[PDB]
Amino acid sequence: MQIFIKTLTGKTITAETEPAETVADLKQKIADKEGVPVDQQRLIFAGKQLEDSKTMADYNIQKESTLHMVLRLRGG
């Protein structure tokens, strides 16, 4: 039950997450991966803002579901 995620750079990111922490997982995973706080990392689906209280099952998005990953450096 894994999905496909792509970034602005065209990178391919694919990893399975929990139905209870779908966004939080990608937020923390990428947070420590880029060295930035989850506050700077957000997930969007076709223009849909996903919150920590939302998951793939919630948006009924699966099966090679396309996702968007945006990363920004801290400055302050």
Q: How far from each other are the two terminal CA atoms of the chain, in whole angstroms?
A: 38
Number of domains the chain is built from: 1
In order, the DSSP letters of 27-68 are HHHHHHHHT--TTT-EEEETTEEE-TT--TTTTT--SS-EEE
**CB environment 37-49: b (16+ within 10 A), e (fewer):** ebebbbbebeeee
Instruction: Quote the radius of gyration of the chain (alpha carbons, Å).
Output: 12
- Whether residue 76 lies inside any domain: the answer is no
Provide the experimental method for this PDB entry: NMR
- Whether residue 59 lies inside any domain: the answer is yes
Q: Which two tokens stand for residue 46?
A: 């076709």
Count CB neighbours of 15 within 10 A: 10
Q: d(Cα 40, Cα 74) in Å, to the nearest integer?
A: 8
User: Residue 13 belongs to a domain with what CATH number?
Assistant: 3.10.20.90
Q: For tokens 């937020």, what's the residue?
A: 27
Domain residues for the domain of 58 are: 3-71
